[PDB]
Design a binder for this molecule. Structure first.
Ligand SMILES: *[C@@H]1O[C@H](CO)[C@@H](O[C@@H]2O[C@H](CO)[C@@H](O[C@H]3O[C@H](CO)[C@@H](O)[C@H](O)[C@@H]3O)[C@H](O)[C@H]2NC(C)=O)[C@H](O)[C@H]1NC(C)=O
Ligand SMILES: *[C@@H]1O[C@H](CO)[C@@H](O[C@@H]2O[C@H](CO)[C@@H](O[C@H]3O[C@H](CO)[C@@H](O)[C@H](O)[C@@H]3O)[C@H](O)[C@H]2NC(C)=O)[C@H](O)[C@H]1NC(C)=O
Ligand SMILES: *[C@@H]1O[C@H](CO)[C@@H](O[C@@H]2O[C@H](CO)[C@@H](O[C@H]3O[C@H](CO)[C@@H](O)[C@H](O)[C@@H]3O)[C@H](O)[C@H]2NC(C)=O)[C@H](O)[C@H]1NC(C)=O
Ligand SMILES: *[C@@H]1O[C@H](CO[C@@H]2O[C@@H](C)[C@@H](O)[C@@H](O)[C@@H]2O)[C@@H](O[C@@H]2O[C@H](CO)[C@@H](O)[C@H](O)[C@H]2NC(C)=O)[C@H](O)[C@H]1NC(C)=O
Ligand SMILES: *[C@@H]1O[C@H](CO[C@@H]2O[C@@H](C)[C@@H](O)[C@@H](O)[C@@H]2O)[C@@H](O[C@@H]2O[C@H](CO)[C@@H](O)[C@H](O)[C@H]2NC(C)=O)[C@H](O)[C@H]1NC(C)=O
Ligand SMILES: *[C@@H]1O[C@H](CO)[C@@H](O[C@@H]2O[C@H](CO)[C@@H](O)[C@H](O)[C@H]2NC(C)=O)[C@H](O)[C@H]1NC(C)=O
Ligand SMILES: *[C@@H]1O[C@H](CO)[C@@H](O[C@@H]2O[C@H](CO)[C@@H](O)[C@H](O)[C@H]2NC(C)=O)[C@H](O)[C@H]1NC(C)=O
Ligand SMILES: *[C@@H]1O[C@H](CO)[C@@H](O)[C@H](O)[C@H]1NC(C)=O
Ligand SMILES: *[C@@H]1O[C@H](CO)[C@@H](O)[C@H](O)[C@H]1NC(C)=O
Ligand SMILES: *[C@@H]1O[C@H](CO)[C@@H](O)[C@H](O)[C@H]1NC(C)=O
Lengths: 195, 133, 49, 49, 35
């Protein structure tokens, strides 16, 4: 219910969240891994203002969205913008790295991040001294694994096929629903004025 | 099964807070659960440490967390402020204080200590009176 | 004063930054037992034609 | 609720390994979860009783 | 009653205290034999 924020001092016991946190300097406020994900799924439009002054002309000869619109099939925009979803995701992330789980149960309660990871290690039955005796290794290995993720999403699109095939199924269903108007259904004509 | 016949550690599965127990009530075509949850309400800031150094040996809480009011150090349980004086029965040892980042210096009490020391004063007051013959 | 339809960009929540540090913790000194209703459908009407 | 706002003992539900924590990231029509898991790496044999 | 149980020593952390308290006692006794 609250929007949490990361503090001005980006230090978390050597854990480097700067790849997954917001970037205040960028016009779209999403993270670096989010900017990767938003280039990896390519959309059948977001319902943004296809105003006639755009595609009354040569555009609809090579644009399936204006062709569908002339048949009354239209896409409505989501209630939450991708910047609104970035603000929620930023609050969930700032909540996690500053407050542990306590922001789920009630008010957020700050804890140092290396003591959060200790509480966690006890959660998996590894005694908390095993974190602190290894904190430089655990952090550098986490920072390396967040690196592997970034590079993996840099290498290929195929991994996001699960979100793309939802987009492709709605695109295919509407293109079919247009093609179905080609059918005669056994009448003298497909096109209605020729009756 | 998991909120009425049990207790759930699944976060926000049995309402917000930490789950205590839940009561089913019937309704037309459905069920109402009255979930009961413990919610941590009023909070106070404290300084904290990952470990204590005493005899060069580093110390960690068996259960709970280290805190200070600004002048004295206590162990307390993670979810509710009840301070305890830092004993060898509240804590366990590993390595030495070169290894733990952010470690702090405070005494760790031993509840065997006065129980032998007051027995040293009994042993001595007998040895000294035993000089009288 | 009078009532009318306004339009607005929706607010997600209160803005609420947190006093994080590498050596401070907040601990609850008191608690509230809370009761919250959660409602689920289990059936719908049986129907025949 | 269970992998971001908590830590979960539930096997596989927050990735392969013992779960520590997870970070949500938004995507077009979806969410991506970056789960962090503790995985045992270099075992030795021992006798036990 | 336990299958596969094995013999080994179990250390007692109070034992070196009461052993150090025995040597502390006996040194007093040696002191009181001295005059
Ligand atoms: C941090 O918590 C400490 C424990 O509650 C607290 O220290 C304690 O303060 C009381 C007095 O306010 C002392 O009481 C003693 O006062 C005199 C002098 O010692 C005696 O004549 C009395 O009989 C009584 O025993 C406690 O002894 C003292 N505890 C310790 C360990 O010294 C601090 O005041 C708290 N500090 C802050 C910043 O809140
Ligand atoms: C926590 O308590 C520790 C024990 O008192 C204390 O360690 C001591 O720190 C001083 C200052 O660095 C050392 O002083 C000596 O340092 C070198 C030798 O290494 C000499 O050249 C100097 O002349 C000086 O004598 C102590 O030797 C050192 N003692 C131990 C057992 O390590 C920590 O500094 C304390 N830390 C805090 C933050 O309170
Ligand atoms: C674990 O430690 C045990 C204690 O030392 C040891 O038990 C002892 O084993 C011997 C051999 O079996 C017994 O010796 C007796 O054997 C029979 C009667 O039981 C007689 O023919 C002999 O004259 C002799 O009295 C000990 O009595 C027995 N002691 C006890 C307390 O059971 C185990 O054998 C050890 N086991 C291993 C695998 O380490
Ligand atoms: C807990 O403390 C933080 C800040 O730490 C203290 O801040 C000083 C006021 C002083 O008490 C010092 O000894 C500590 O360093 C509080 O955060 C402040 O919150 C107020 C609003 O309540 C805000 O105006 C300030 O700008 C904040 N400053 C900082 C540094 O965070 C926080 O409110 C305290 N919470 C409780 C419950 O006491
Ligand atoms: C753990 O030990 C097993 C078998 O026990 C060992 O057997 C001897 C080789 C000797 O070293 C004993 O003292 C040990 O108790 C290992 O299993 C064998 O592994 C080798 C390859 O290293 C393989 O050729 C054999 O076929 C394996 N035997 C069986 C029964 O599978 C096992 O590899 C050891 N684990 C580790 C991590 O080293
Ligand atoms: C956190 O990790 C990121 C990389 O994932 C680091 O950012 C890089 O830093 C080097 C050195 O300044 C630059 O050459 C790279 O171009 C940076 N990459 C990006 C994406 O900015 C960052 O420095 C790390 N944080 C810390 C504190 O070391
Ligand atoms: C635990 O495994 C890690 C690797 O996963 C080991 O860390 C590396 O150790 C070598 C030397 O053995 C160094 O060259 C590397 O720089 C280390 N990597 C990192 C990320 O720090 C570590 O030594 C192993 N520790 C034990 C006790 O076996
Ligand atoms: C001193 O020793 C005598 C026995 O020699 C005993 O009666 C007396 O109670 C002892 N007093 C103390 C204080 O030990
Ligand atoms: C935390 O400690 C680091 C050094 O590890 C220091 O740079 C930083 O200023 C400290 N910040 C706070 C808020 O304690
Ligand atoms: C016996 O104890 C006294 C102190 O009470 C000490 O001064 C003396 O040196 C001891 N005697 C010997 C012979 O060690």
């Amino acid at each position: 219910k609250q929007i949490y924020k990361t503090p001005p001092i980006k230090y978390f016991g050597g854990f480097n969240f700067s790849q997954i946190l917001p970037d205040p300097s960028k016009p779209s406020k999403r993270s670096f891994i989010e900017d990767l994900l938003f280039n990896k799924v390519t959309l059948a439009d977001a319902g943004f203002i296809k105003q006639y002054g755009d595609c009354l002309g040569d555009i609809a000869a090579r644009d399936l969205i204006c062709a569908q619109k002339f048949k009354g099939l239209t896409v409505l925009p989501p209630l939450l913008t991708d910047e609104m979803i970035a603000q929620y995701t930023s609050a969930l992330l700032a909540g996690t790295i500053t407050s542990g789980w306590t922001f789920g149960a009630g008010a957020a309660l700050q804890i140092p991040f290396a003591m959060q990871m200790a509480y966690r290690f006890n959660g998996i039955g590894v005694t908390q001294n095993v974190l602190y005796e290894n904190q430089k290794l655990i952090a550098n290995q986490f920072n390396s694994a967040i690196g592997k993720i970034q590079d993996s999403l840099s290498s290929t699109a195929s991994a996001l096929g699960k979100l793309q095939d939802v987009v492709n199924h709605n695109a295919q269903a509407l293109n079919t629903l247009v093609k179905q108007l080609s059918s005669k259904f056994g009448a003298i004509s497909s096109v209605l004025n020729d009756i | 099964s998991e909120c009425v016949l049990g207790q759930s550690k699944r976060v926000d599965f049995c309402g917000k807070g930490y789950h205590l127990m839940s009561f089913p009530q019937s309704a037309p075509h459905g069920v109402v659960f009255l979930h009961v949850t413990y919610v941590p309400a009023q909070e106070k800031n404290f300084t904290t440490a990952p470990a204590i150094c005493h005899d060069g040996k580093a110390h960690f809480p068996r259960e709970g967390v280290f805190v200070s009011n600004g002048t004295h150090w206590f162990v307390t349980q993670r979810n509710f402020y009840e301070p305890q004086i830092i004993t060898t029965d509240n804590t366990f040892v590993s390595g030495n204080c070169d290894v733990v980042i952010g470690i702090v210096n405070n005494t760790v009490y031993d509840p065997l200590q006065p129980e032998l020391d007051s027995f040293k004063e009994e042993l001595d007051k007998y040895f000294k009176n035993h000089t009288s013959p | 004063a009078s009532q009318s339809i306004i339009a607005y960009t929706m607010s997600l929540g209160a803005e609420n930054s947190v006093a994080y540090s590498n050596n401070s913790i907040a601990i609850p000194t008191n608690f509230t037992i809370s009761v919250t209703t959660e409602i689920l459908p289990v059936s719908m009407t049986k129907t025949s034609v």
